[PDB]
Design a protein around this ligand. Structure first.
Ligand code: FAD
Length: 469
């Protein structure tokens, strides 16, 4: 193929100067909206960073090391002494005194230790029971049965039963609350078909498609959201063929519970949106669309460098992804009859920009925010909840991984890459030396700043040359 599908294909790996140049005026926040977004972003990031006075406290340690001149060892040493001096019960005494196999096991252990913060429960019953606390406060949940990249027919069968079981449990706990207020499920197509990574069209339709359909019908019986997670870029096209067919199932007609992730770090993203708008129209439904930046960036970069093709399917500078996300968000927000946008982010500027771009006169079913468990709750503690409690009163859906240690590894590595990259907002917020204004800097303005320095808009990362170079 159709007009929208061909345009996707044609954008696959378009040059970055071109793709970024095209997004810029779509992502640019108008004057007033920009400043209200900056203000809100600053306030969110401030409260977040300085929750327990981290910056105030940083500036005490700095101003003591500065107006007396100690190292970060001599200053620590003095606090140890000041600490003991403040265990001396009587002030008179205090003042009088002063005046006068191994590698495999470490890897597995460090994974469990680091990973636990990202997991909501070992089983679906446990995760569901831990969900009332935040659900009272106005949070929603999407449960992710951890496990992906099924290597055998047995692996895939096991994931399929774990997903079926999960939908029963989630659905019974939902109890008719529906697709917006009630819990949903997230699935990975890679879990449902053996060797998904290289699967051919015909086998996927014959074997994957009947399983996707069956889980979706079950979700529909319970009236819960069922979201298709986005994985590696070379699976985008087959995921769209599966979505298309699923949208025209007679048993799914009139039901708006189908969810689908799109990744803004891909060049194709805006063209996928045009395709999705057309699919909701032809299939007579409102699609739930999670807009994310994307989780596989390091691997996509390595992959394209080994394939030696014309270019990258993703952007090479983080700021360009940020720009693509805002442009895609505007596109999504303009067609509320056709799409329920779910704006997944832990970035305070990102959140503030969406809040402002969504316009005045919010209504619950306009959009929601989303966040990953163990990453977003502090930001969204300021967002979800009553206005009289100082909150924005916008709903947030927490993506809740559910599993034991044996399903955790791939998810955890993605989290470590996310948390540990110097470009990540969650990494920069915890840096008290980075000024709030740079942390929440507008991406479009960031890109024009580069383009004036560098001589052109949207040049690739200087350390990430084309695969052929
Ligand atoms: C609820 C939820 C569901 C999600 N589901 C999926 C999913 O199904 N599939 C998926 O792929 N991702 C998914 N993600 C997104 C991903 O897991 C990260 O959480 C997200 O990309 C971080 O974006 P941010 O706005 O929070 O952070 P920011 O720090 O503002 O942006 C972070 C990122 O920018 C991108 N990036 C990093 N470096 C570069 C670079 N040099 N050039 C271009 N881009 C760069 C990467 O996408 C990285 O995640 C999901 C996220 C959430 C919150």
């Amino acid at each position: 193929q159709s007009v929208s599908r061909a345009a996707i294909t044609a954008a696959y790996r378009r040059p970055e100067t071109e793709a970024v140049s095209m997004l810029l005026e779509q992502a640019r926040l108008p004057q007033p909206v920009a400043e209200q977004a900056h203000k809100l972003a600053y306030q969110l990031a401030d409260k977040l960073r300085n929750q327990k006075n981290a910056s105030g406290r940083a500036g005490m340690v700095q101003g003591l090391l500065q107006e007396f001149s100690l190292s970060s060892q001599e200053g620590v040493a003095l606090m140890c002494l000041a600490e003991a001096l403040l265990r001396i019960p009587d002030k008179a005494t205090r003042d009088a005194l002063i005046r006068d196999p191994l590698i495999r096991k470490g890897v597995d252990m460090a994974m469990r230790l680091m990973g636990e913060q990202f997991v909501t429960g070992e089983t679906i019953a446990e995760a569901l029971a831990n969900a009332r606390k935040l659900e009272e406060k106005g949070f929603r949940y999407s449960y992710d049965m951890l496990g992906e990249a099924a290597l055998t027919a047995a692996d895939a069968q096991a994931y399929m039963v774990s997903y079926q079981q999960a939908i029963h449990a989630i659905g019974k706990a939902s109890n008719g609350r529906g697709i917006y207020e009630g819990p949903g499920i997230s699935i990975k197509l890679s879990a449902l078909h053996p060797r998904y990574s290289r699967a051919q069209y015909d086998r996927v339709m014959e074997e994957l498609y009947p399983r996707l359909k069956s889980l979706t019908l079950l979700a529909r019986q319970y009236d819960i959201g069922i979201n298709i997670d986005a994985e590696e870029s070379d699976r985008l096209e087959i995921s769209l063929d599966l979505l298309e067919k699923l949208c025209f199932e007679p048993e799914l007609a009139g039901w708006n519970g189908i969810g689908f992730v799109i990744q803004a770090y891909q060049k194709r993203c805006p063209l996928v949106i045009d395709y999705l708008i057309d699919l909701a129209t032809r299939s007579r439904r409102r699609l739930m669309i999670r807009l994310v930046k994307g989780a596989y960036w390091d691997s996509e970069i390595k992959r394209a460098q080994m394939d030696g093709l014309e270019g990258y399917p993703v952007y090479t500078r983080k700021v360009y992804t940020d720009v693509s996300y805002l442009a895609c968000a505007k596109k999504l927000l303009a067609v509320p009859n056709l799409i329920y946008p779910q704006f997944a982010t832990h970035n305070a500027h990102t959140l503030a920009a969406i809040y402002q771009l969504a316009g005045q006169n919010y209504y619950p079913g306009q959009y929601e925010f989303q966040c990953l468990h163990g990453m977003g709750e502090p930001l969204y503690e300021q967002v979800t909840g009553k206005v009289a409690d100082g909150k924005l009163n916008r709903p947030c859906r927490i993506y809740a991984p559910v599993g034991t240690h044996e399903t955790l590894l791939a998810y955890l590595v993605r989290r470590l890459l996310e948390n540990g990259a110097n470009t990540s907002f969650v990494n920069r917020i915890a840096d008290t030396s980075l000024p709030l204004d740079e942390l929440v800097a507008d991406p479009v303005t960031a890109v024009e700043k580069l383009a004036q320095q560098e001589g052109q808009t949207g040049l690739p990362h200087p350390k990430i040359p084309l695969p052929r170079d």
